[PDB]
Each structure stands twice: as C-alpha cells, then as structure tokens.
C-alpha cells in the first residue's frame, strides 16, 4: 500500500458526502446505492463514518463530468481516465468525479462497475495512493469481480492512516 506525499488524511472520523449530479446510464437510486456501498467498503475497517447531505459543501463532493468540468483536470472522452479523486484536504480535497463519457453499469457491457470505480476513487479521497499489490482495490488497474472483498493490503494501508474501530 502507499500514501500521498506527506500522508494527508481527514482530521475527523465523521465525513460528509454530497452527490451533485447524475449519469443517464443508471437509475439515481442505483447510483446512490453504488456510492453508499463504496463508502461502506472503507467504513467496514476504520472508524470513518460517511453521512450524506443534500445542501451545502460536503467534505466529499461527488459528481459526473465530461472533458473540462471545472477543476482544470479535464476528462478525455471514452477510455483513458474513468474517474478521479483528490487527496484529503479542504476545498477540492476529497472530491470524486466520474467521467460520464464512460458507460456506467454494475460491471457488464462495454463499461464499468460504478461501485468498483467509486470504491477505488474513494480510496484516494481517503488518502491512499496506488498499491503495488495486484489484488488490492488500490491497484492501478480496474479488474471486475462479481463478489468484491477488500484485500489485506488495503485494510493495512487505510488503518495505518485511521486505525481500526474499537
């Protein structure tokens, strides 16, 4: 496992998120659930607790975008970047954006599981860099699987930043 330079992390365990926009690819309820389950991956093994809000600035602002979408880190059409997220911090820190020039599914088709990409993206949003462990959620490659389970590399990494729940 790895961290960003200087190991940035959230200075509190209660973290807010907000879904600012949606994709036409999936029902909004499916999108919401995908994100909820992606956060639960991490709250399973840390004292981090993620609360949704529908107004104001959440710690983790979630949105879909295409090409240049307001942060000066443009997406690139279909293929290439699927999504990105910023390391923990104020403002754009923690924010997680998904390239809607990709087809968002739950893993089937010429497309990508929103749950799996979100879980990976949220790893970055929590302060994890890419892992050299190929079986890790934080591996730099997307691999689809029907029954996802957080690897020991991911667990050890995230807990080195936040500890385990008592």
């Amino acid at each position: 496992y790895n961290f960003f330079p200087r190991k940035p992390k959230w200075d509190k365990n209660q973290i807010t998120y907000r879904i600012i926009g949606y994709t036409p690819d999936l029902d909004p309820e499916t999108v919401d659930d995908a994100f909820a389950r992606a956060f639960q991956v991490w709250s399973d093994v840390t004292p981090l607790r993620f609360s949704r809000i529908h107004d104001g600035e959440a710690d983790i602002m979630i949105n879909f975008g295409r090409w240049e979408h307001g942060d000066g880190y443009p997406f690139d059409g279909k293929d290439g970047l699927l999504a990105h997220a910023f390391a923990p911090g104020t403002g754009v820190g923690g924010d997680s954006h998904f390239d809607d020039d990709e087809l968002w599914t739950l893993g089937k088709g010429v497309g990508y599981s929103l749950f799996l990409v979100a879980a990976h993206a949220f790893g970055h949003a929590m302060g994890l860099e890419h892992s050299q462990d190929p079986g890790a959620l934080m591996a730099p490659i997307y691999t689809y699987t029907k029954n996802f389970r957080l690897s020991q590399d991911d667990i050890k990494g995230i807990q080195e930043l936040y500890g385990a729940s008592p």
């Binding site: 990105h84 403002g91 970055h124 997307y142």
Partner: peptide, 10 residues
C-alpha cells in the same frame, strides 16, 4: 484497464 493518473492532490 488502467485507471491512469486518477489520484490527484488539492
């Protein structure tokens, strides 16, 4: 497929 450099800093 690669994620590319999807890990950014604020």
């Amino acid at each position: 497929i690669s994620y590319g450099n999807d890990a950014l800093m604020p």
